[PDB]
Write a protein that binds this ligand. Sequence first.
Ligand code: HEM
Length: 301
Amino acid sequence: GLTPDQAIDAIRGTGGAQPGCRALHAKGTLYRGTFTATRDAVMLSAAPHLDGSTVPALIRFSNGSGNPKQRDGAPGVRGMAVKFTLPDGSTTDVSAQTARLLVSSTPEGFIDLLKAMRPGLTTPLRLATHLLTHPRLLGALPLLREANRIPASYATTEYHGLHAFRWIAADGSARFVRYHLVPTAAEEYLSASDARGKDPDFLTDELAARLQDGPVRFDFRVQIAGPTDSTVDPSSAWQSTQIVTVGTVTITGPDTEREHGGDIVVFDPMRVTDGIEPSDDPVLRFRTLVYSASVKLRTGV
Ligand code: HEM
């Protein structure tokens, strides 16, 4: 079958798996903040960080590329990851990127795509024999484009968790939800034109400047599964419009005490907590493993 090593191989074949870098989302910065849920969130989940208290929040804004030197101005996926610290010291992560849905419904599908995406031999050719294997992708371009827009700022675009998570409340009630991190700032993007002229790391510079002006806010929203919404296929579009705000992440500045020495920082979608369980999503379950591989490759060097 498919192994973590293989996943890393496909990733490396796309320019990723660089030394001392995350196999993917190599380029990214850490920020400090806090999170406070709405008064009602505790009715959806019993998770400690959702009870209404304020908890520490570590955020990483990144470019999806495995290339540490990726150009902010070039097309690509951006990722927003939040690590919540619970009262007892434990932590639970929320991982999200700019795409509305996943390009594939399975890990194999995603990996097969990262291989046929490799440069050299016949790039535009093999990156087609895939379409034949995965029809679903022929109508994707529309979403793919949206997921690669060049945001004017990491603070002016929204991120999605894609996978469905089962939220259990103290009363025993449960519901499946998909995560969405929306900005309180107006969403805003740059045309390919402007994007080209921008500094390689303009996104890092603008956000540093934005925070010196004041905090940046993102509302955490959960889209609650409708009667026919798949809880196992992150590529499947959901019909439900029952989307509610359950909290806000308030980012106040760049972090400086983290990732010094043998300190490792990894946002694992599987790092849930009491009151939150993972769905039988094959992509979500495979991630934690391929991540361990990636974390290993960068721990040593
Ligand atoms: C099955 C296919 C996937 C693979 C193989 C994969 C692999 C990776 C790898 C290797 C990293 C670097 C991990 C590290 O060293 O800590 C990463 C980071 C990340 N991935 Fe994925 N990923 C996949 C799917 C997804 C999906 C569907 C999402 C959407 C929510 C996602 C969101 C992220 C984010 C936000 C980061 C940033 C982590 C950070 O900044 O610390 N990934 N992924």
